[PDB]
Design a protein around this ligand. Structure first.
Ligand SMILES: O=C1CC(=O)N([C@@H]2O[C@H](COP(=O)(O)O)[C@@H](O)[C@H]2O)C(=O)N1
Ligand SMILES: O=C1CC(=O)N([C@@H]2O[C@H](COP(=O)(O)O)[C@@H](O)[C@H]2O)C(=O)N1
Lengths: 218, 217
């Protein structure tokens, strides 16, 4: 599994290249894995991936929540990996064929798929939560090895870990700003994702070091 | 939204030159283009402004928005900044995520389209069973624009029943995926075509043919 420094992933959702670069640079000693999503990509272009690779020693996870038909999913994955992303995050709710399309491209191109099972926000309870266990089981059956699950619902995160087993890799957002607890989340997740708690801090480095101190025994 | 010939081009070519040429080749038949991630991630968000400059077409950003509210807001803002007239949002992540998009759309003078059931076989696993409830959520939220599947006319009909005749409904899955143009226009206001047009030896002839087949509609 990818070796994530300090079990910590930065969600770089600043939409300004100068700010995104500054903040990422400031926490570089603490984090070697960066999640880049559409807020930054749609503001600055896919070449932002190339710039992050050039400037930092960081793994890139493209958080594109891929959620289209198989044919379109294939194209999205090809463009994303072509740009230098190490991995891509894909939604499970559109079904097995849509996931398989992403897995197939990742296999061909030598990269990885993360499967988003349940989400961390209140709205996730309406439809996703009820499908989440089955989405995860589908992931296992498809041979998915990397997963995303919600820090805001520890009981649900625990269940997801059970389904996918101890060998699978699990990362979890919703820590800090959304109210999830780093320590409790790391009971089940391999790595935790932080956005606003770090990138909106007056001193992002101090924020990162503080989080690290809080989980040092883990 | 007045869509010329009830026809929307899904421009999912991933090369700027090809995308521009092919769109130019069918410009006389359309005035509404759906641009998605295949083109955007290959050529950048500036392509949207370029389409407006070349064609004056309206642009629907098909981004299947499916994040938490905070991120959805950012995605819509960046998308509308690029000149998109509308954005497509998934309903499956729930009401708060859709509302985030509605907010930005209102602020910038744009429209949200709610995707309720999808056209591909995998849609049967999870989406289909939630689709009616997603449509009603749209109604509750005041959504006026919807997307539903050409590949399942009975499902598309049900979606039309839920949203009412006043709502605007567009439908992909026509041609390549098996949907029929005429049958689909029984329920949808406009039909979406990607491959049947943009992979056609002669895209203009492909569009002309489609129009011929629905001319009475
Ligand atoms: O269940 C989900 C999945 C997701 O990727 N994320 C995202 O993970 C990040 C959370 O950031 P923050 O720490 O709440 O600022 C953002 O990039 C989100 O889009 C989420 O918050 N919940
Ligand atoms: O349920 C869905 C929604 C969607 O937007 N679309 C898309 O609409 C287009 C269909 O293109 P095509 O006509 O099958 O080549 C693509 O851009 C797809 O991503 C889909 O085919 N089914």
């Amino acid at each position: 599994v990818m070796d994530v420094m300090n079990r910590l992933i930065l969600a770089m959702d600043l939409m300004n290249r100068d700010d995104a670069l500054r903040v990422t640079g400031e926490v570089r000693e603490y984090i070697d894995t960066v999640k880049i999503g559409y807020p930054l990509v749609l503001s600055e272009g896919m070449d932002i991936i190339a710039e992050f690779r050039k400037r930092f020693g960081c793994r890139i996870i493209a958080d594109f929540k891929v959620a289209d038909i198989p044919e379109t999913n294939e194209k999205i994955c090809r463009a994303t990996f072509k740009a230098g992303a190490d991995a891509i995050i894909v939604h499970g709710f559109p079904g097995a064929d849509s996931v398989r399309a992403c897995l197939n491209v990742a296999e061909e191109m030598g990269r990885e798929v993360f499967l988003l099972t349940e989400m961390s926000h209140p709205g996730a309870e309406m439809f996703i939560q009820g499908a989440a266990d089955e989405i995860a089981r589908m992931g296992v059956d498809l041979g998915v090895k990397n997963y995303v699950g919600p820090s805001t619902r520890p009981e649900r995160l625990s269940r997801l870990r059970e389904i996918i087993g101890q060998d699978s890799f699990l990362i979890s957002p919703g820590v800090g700003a959304q109210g999830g607890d780093p320590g409790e989340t790391l009971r089940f997740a391999d790595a935790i994702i932080f956005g606003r708690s770090i990138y909106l801090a007056d001193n992002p480095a101090a924020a990162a070091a503080g989080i690290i101190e809080s989980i040092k025994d883990l």
